[PDB]
Swiss-Prot record:
Listed name of the protein: Kelch-like ECH-associated protein 1
Phenotype upon changing residue 159 to M: Impaired interaction with NFE2L2/NRF2
Outcome when changing residue 206 to A: Impaired interaction with SQSTM1/p62
Kelch repeats, residue ranges: 3-48, 49-99, 100-146, 147-193, 195-240, 241-287
Chain segments annotated as coiled-coil in the UniProt record: none
Swiss-Prot/TrEMBL keywords: Cytoplasm, Kelch repeat, Nucleus, Repeat, S-nitrosylation, Thioether bond, Ubl conjugation, Ubl conjugation pathway
Domain of life assignment: Eukaryota
Function: Substrate-specific adapter of a BCR (BTB-CUL3-RBX1) E3 ubiquitin ligase complex that regulates the response to oxidative stress by targeting NFE2L2/NRF2 for ubiquitination. KEAP1 acts as a key sensor of oxidative and electrophilic stress: in normal conditions, the BCR(KEAP1) complex mediates ubiquitination and degradation of NFE2L2/NRF2, a transcription factor regulating expression of many cytoprotective genes.
Portion of the full-length sequence here: 325 to 612 of 624
């Protein structure tokens, strides 16, 4: 695509902002708000359409977990509702495989989901698949070689360094090598042949460390850390570079945006969001 879209988030309350960043010229764009404010959501893209999944509206009028799926069309600058998931999923992970959207984990009140479900846009229908082996909220999710990985999170009692992989043709979950660090609410994405896990919360401190899982060697390896410790961040990939947006560093809701270049193994600050916020959903698609 061309732009990095950030949707929703949290600062004092849940937010409805949809803002698009252009790495080519540095410009931010404010776009049509979400119909319902929501933090802890996840974003993804299918067929050029942006999708916001799950989350939670923390508002003075109350707190409502979201089972909602909403579709933004850059061509029209409009949000359309889609079929809702089987359950509310706050602090959700999502991954796209073969044009289908996998919703992973999340919480519904004090319920910490291990359930997983799949959305087929061509039929506007969700269907439950095999549940993970672990309850995970604040779970990182990524797709590599058409395999779905759930990384870290919180299972209702402990933050996790564990990770697992879902094989669709077998409808099966299997544990993989655990991370060297406990991370909940981390940013997880894919670059080349590696699953990157960045930041998060280990139970005591917000993390700036970053590690990556090589699916061939089945090993986790730390890389250069981010400039800012940060949890509940948005993460995406643009032109073979990782972008991490916002988060919470234990003192401030960050408007910082960092960019990781894997050839030099260096992070650099590339811009600031229009305001500090955590728990955004992030994806990449064409300009509107
Ligand atoms: C002082 C207030 C701190 C705060 C931070 C984030 C959010 S938020 O609105 O961005 N919510 C959200 C989003 C994505 C993940 C998570 N998440 N999930 C599990 C855990 C954990 O700590 O174990 C976390 C926590 C570590 C992030 C939560 C609201 C408030």
């Amino acid at each position: 695509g061309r732009l990095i879209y950030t949707a929703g988030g949290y600062f004092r309350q849940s937010l409805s902002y949809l803002e698009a960043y252009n790495p080519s010229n540095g410009s931010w764009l404010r776009l049509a708000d979400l119909q319902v404010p929501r933090s802890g959501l996840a974003g993804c893209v299918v067929g050029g359409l942006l999708y916001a999944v799950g989350g939670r509206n923390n508002s003075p009028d109350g707190n409502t977990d979201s089972s909602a799926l909403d579709c933004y069309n850059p061509m029209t600058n409009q949000w359309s509702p889609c079929a809702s998931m089987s359950v509310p999923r706050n602090r959700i992970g999502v991954g796209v495989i073969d044009g289908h959207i996998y919703a992973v984990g999340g919480s519904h009140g004090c319920i910490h989901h291990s359930s997983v479900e799949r959305y087929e846009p061509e039929r506007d229908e969700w269907h439950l698949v095999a549940p993970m082996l672990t309850r995970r909220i604040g779970v990182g999710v990524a797709v590599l070689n058409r395999l779905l990985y759930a990384v870290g999170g919180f299972d209702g009692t402990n933050r996790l360094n564990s990770a697992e992989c879902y094989y669709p043709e077998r409808n099966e979950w299997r544990m993989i090598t655990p991370m060297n660090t406990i991370r909940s609410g981390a940013g997880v994405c894919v670059l080349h042949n590696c699953i990157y896990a960045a930041g998060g919360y280990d139970g005591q401190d917000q993390l700036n460390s970053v590690e990556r899982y090589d699916v061939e060697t089945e090993t986790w390896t730390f890389v250069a850390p981010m400039r800012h410790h940060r949890s509940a961040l948005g993460i995406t990939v643009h032109q073979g570079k990782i972008y991490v947006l916002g988060g919470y560093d234990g003192h401030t809701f960050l408007d910082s945006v960092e960019c990781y270049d894997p050839d030099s193994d260096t992070w650099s600050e590339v811009t600031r969001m229009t305001s500090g916020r955590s728990g955004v959903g992030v994806a990449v698609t064409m300009e509107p």
